[PDB]
Design a protein around this ligand. Structure first.
Ligand code: HEM
Length: 147
């Protein structure tokens, strides 16, 4: 289904002003659901590979901001995601090459919905949750070409 654009745009405003705070919620959920992702971050951390320091490092914070900016790109292009097909395919290839499993992107989708739910509370309606599931599903499909 094409995600209902107004529901995507309005609900995104909840997180989009403070993207590091909200992206940090997403990542907390990601580690709660798939804690085995930590080593992949640790081994890619250049400044500090120990757990706490890697997770608080500029590289890791930068990556939280990158995740939120890619979702913002999908929100702002929700009516025509063809404008991100090559970017997303290449993004998938890049993750595959640093050892990420395609299946971990399902965990990310769960974490994104969790983040939104926490920000919006009862404004995160079933229609709005569905629209997000559809938008994220289209992003992962475009990325999945990289595996
Ligand atoms: C599933 C968990 C994820 C892991 C373990 C992960 C890990 C990484 C790693 C290690 C890099 C560095 C790649 C390199 O040096 O070539 C990277 C880059 C990046 N990641 Fe992720 N990532 C994840 C999910 C995501 C998601 C969901 C997005 C956005 C939807 C995203 C956006 C990016 C971007 C934009 C870059 C920069 C790519 C570039 O340099 O061209 N990541 N990620």
């Amino acid at each position: 289904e094409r995600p209902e654009p107004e529901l995507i745009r309005q609900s995104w405003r909840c997180v989009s002003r403070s993207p590091l705070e909200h992206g940090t919620v997403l990542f907390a959920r990601l580690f709660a659901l798939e804690p085995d992702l930590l080593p992949l971050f640790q081994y890619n951390c250049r400044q500090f590979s120990s757990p706490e320091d890697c997770l608080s490092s500029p590289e890791f914070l930068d990556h939280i901001r990158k995740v939120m900016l890619v979702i913002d790109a999908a929100v702002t292009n929700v009516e025509d995601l063809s404008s991100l097909e090559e970017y997303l395919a290449s993004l998938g290839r890049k993750h595959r090459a640093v050892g990420v499993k395609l299946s971990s992107f399902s965990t990310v989708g769960e974490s994104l919905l969790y983040m939104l739910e926490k920000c919006l509370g009862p404004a995160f309606t079933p229609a709005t949750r569905a629209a997000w599931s559809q938008l994220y599903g289209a992003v992962v499909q475009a990325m999945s070409r990289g595996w």
